Write an enzyme that holds these catalytic residues in place. Structure first.
Site, mmCIF file in Angstrom:
data_model
loop_
_atom_site.group_PDB
_atom_site.id
_atom_site.type_symbol
_atom_site.label_atom_id
_atom_site.label_comp_id
_atom_site.label_asym_id
_atom_site.label_seq_id
_atom_site.Cartn_x
_atom_site.Cartn_y
_atom_site.Cartn_z
ATOM 1 N N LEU A 21 5.202 -6.291 0.975
ATOM 2 C CA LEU A 21 4.990 -7.369 0.011
ATOM 3 C C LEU A 21 5.847 -7.205 -1.246
ATOM 4 C CD1 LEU A 21 1.263 -8.183 0.169
ATOM 5 C CD2 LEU A 21 3.048 -8.994 1.677
ATOM 6 N N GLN A 25 10.890 0.650 -8.359
ATOM 7 C CA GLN A 25 11.244 2.013 -8.752
ATOM 8 C C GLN A 25 10.248 3.078 -8.208
ATOM 9 O OE1 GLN A 25 12.082 2.157 -13.233
ATOM 10 N NE2 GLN A 25 12.281 4.320 -12.640
ATOM 11 N N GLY A 27 7.671 2.814 -5.718
ATOM 12 C CA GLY A 27 7.209 2.751 -4.340
ATOM 13 C C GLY A 27 7.046 1.292 -3.957
ATOM 14 N N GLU A 28 6.240 1.058 -2.919
ATOM 15 C CA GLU A 28 6.118 -0.251 -2.276
ATOM 16 C C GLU A 28 4.656 -0.734 -2.180
ATOM 17 O OE1 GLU A 28 8.340 1.044 1.501
ATOM 18 O OE2 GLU A 28 9.906 -0.242 0.666
ATOM 19 N N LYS A 43 -0.583 0.427 -1.459
ATOM 20 C CA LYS A 43 0.480 0.805 -2.412
ATOM 21 C C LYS A 43 0.884 2.265 -2.172
ATOM 22 C CE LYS A 43 0.220 1.036 -7.275
ATOM 23 N NZ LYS A 43 0.430 0.423 -8.651
ATOM 24 N N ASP A 134 -2.994 -4.881 -19.973
ATOM 25 C CA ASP A 134 -1.934 -5.524 -19.186
ATOM 26 C C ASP A 134 -2.508 -6.850 -18.604
ATOM 27 O OD1 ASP A 134 0.714 -5.520 -18.203
ATOM 28 O OD2 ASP A 134 0.316 -4.072 -16.597
HETATM 29 C C1 KBM Z 1 4.342 -11.737 -1.187
HETATM 30 O O1 KBM Z 1 3.262 -12.189 -2.029
HETATM 31 C C2 KBM Z 1 2.008 -11.606 -2.004
HETATM 32 C C3 KBM Z 1 0.968 -12.200 -1.238
HETATM 33 C C4 KBM Z 1 -0.318 -11.640 -1.180
HETATM 34 C C5 KBM Z 1 -0.517 -10.471 -1.924
HETATM 35 O O2 KBM Z 1 -1.668 -9.658 -2.088
HETATM 36 C C6 KBM Z 1 -1.336 -8.609 -2.930
HETATM 37 C C7 KBM Z 1 -2.483 -7.693 -3.164
HETATM 38 O O3 KBM Z 1 -3.528 -7.959 -2.581
HETATM 39 C C8 KBM Z 1 -2.377 -6.484 -4.079
HETATM 40 C C9 KBM Z 1 -3.526 -5.695 -4.254
HETATM 41 C C10 KBM Z 1 -3.498 -4.571 -5.095
HETATM 42 C C11 KBM Z 1 -2.336 -4.186 -5.782
HETATM 43 CL CL1 KBM Z 1 -2.407 -2.696 -6.845
HETATM 44 C C12 KBM Z 1 -1.182 -4.986 -5.609
HETATM 45 C C13 KBM Z 1 -1.199 -6.125 -4.773
HETATM 46 C C14 KBM Z 1 0.009 -8.647 -3.369
HETATM 47 C C15 KBM Z 1 0.544 -9.838 -2.730
HETATM 48 C C16 KBM Z 1 1.806 -10.430 -2.755
#
Ligand code: KBM
EC number: 2.7.10.2
Length: 271
Positions: A21, A25, A27-28, A43, A134
């Protein structure tokens, strides 16, 4: 509790990373499954990019703030590479979601609903003696049912004595950050209340950058004069006046998040 006792620890084997997703810098972020059937966000920490202690401090803090209105910690894998596994939010971030075709067709009535859900999450944080630091539409996630939740607790801090003071060198986004925090490094729940005001602009403008066409030094300067963000296009005046309350000069004059919640719920059942 050590890893072998922590109820949040899961073997890495329980997890399948399916769709990436995001990558940065440090991680992913992935969409993945836990034990085959349960959709989760994962994450991952890029080794050496930052301290594994600092990375995991986000998870330990989410162990203390569990509420319906807050993105829930699902698990951790504490062996390299380190994973923090959280609640999956199918509509991604608020800021992206409000720009999609679904996002674009939302009534002012649903926007005010969504604003009340966010105030409600921050009312929990306020009552638990935490600050977020934030708070902004990039850090509210939206579910499949168009309900909202607070996310990204990397800067979140427990408050014993009223204030958390940052380091002399530390930098924060000038448009979303209360003046006292930018200027003195001092944060309180009342700094988050100021952020919520900015976040209200992003809701009503479908995720536009605050202070249309101003640079940071212009924004700081206007604020010191006593000016506040110009009335966003198509902003109900009631909501504009609620934003102004959030932007009161004196921190202690700004409302509680519970007041903001109740006003927003009134605004919404009235539309
Ligand atoms: C590509 O777009 C999207 C779509 C759906 C998406 O769900 C997320 C999350 O659920 C999420 C949950 C927790 C964190 Cl720390 C970061 C992201 C990120 C995300 C990005």
């Amino acid at each position: 509790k050590p890893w072998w006792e922590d109820e949040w620890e899961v073997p890495r084997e329980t997890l399948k990373l399916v769709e990436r997703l995001g990558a940065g810098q440090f991680g992913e972020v992935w969409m993945g499954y836990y034990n085959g059937h349960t959709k989760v966000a994962v994450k991952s920490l890029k080794q050496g990019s930052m301290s594994p202690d600092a990375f995991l401090a986000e998870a330990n803090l989410m162990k203390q703030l569990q509420h319906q209105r807050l993105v829930r910690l699902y698990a951790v894998v504490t062996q390299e590479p380190i994973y923090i596994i959280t609640e999956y939010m199918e509509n991604g971030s608020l800021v992206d979601f409000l720009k999609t075709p679904s996002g674009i067709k939302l009534t002012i009535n649903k926007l005010l609903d969504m604003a009340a859900q966010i105030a409600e999450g921050m009312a929990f944080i306020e009552e638990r003696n935490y600050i977020h630091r934030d708070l902004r539409a990039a850090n509210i996630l939206v579910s499949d049912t168009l309900s909202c939740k607070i996310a990204d607790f990397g800067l979140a801090r427990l408050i014993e004595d009223n204030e958390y003071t940052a380091r002399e060198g530390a930098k924060f986004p000038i448009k979303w950050t209360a003046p006292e925090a930018i200027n003195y490094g001092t944060f309180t729940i009342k700094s988050d209340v100021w952020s919520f005001g900015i976040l209200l602009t992003e809701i009503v403008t479908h995720g536009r950058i605050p202070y249309p066409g101003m640079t940071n030094p212009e924004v700081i300067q206007n604020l010191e004069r006593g000016y506040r963000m110009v009335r966003p296009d198509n902003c109900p005046e009631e909501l504009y006046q609620l934003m102004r309350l959030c932007w009161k000069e004196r921190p202690e004059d700004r409302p509680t998040f519970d007041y903001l919640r109740s006003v927003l719920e009134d605004f919404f059942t009235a539309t």
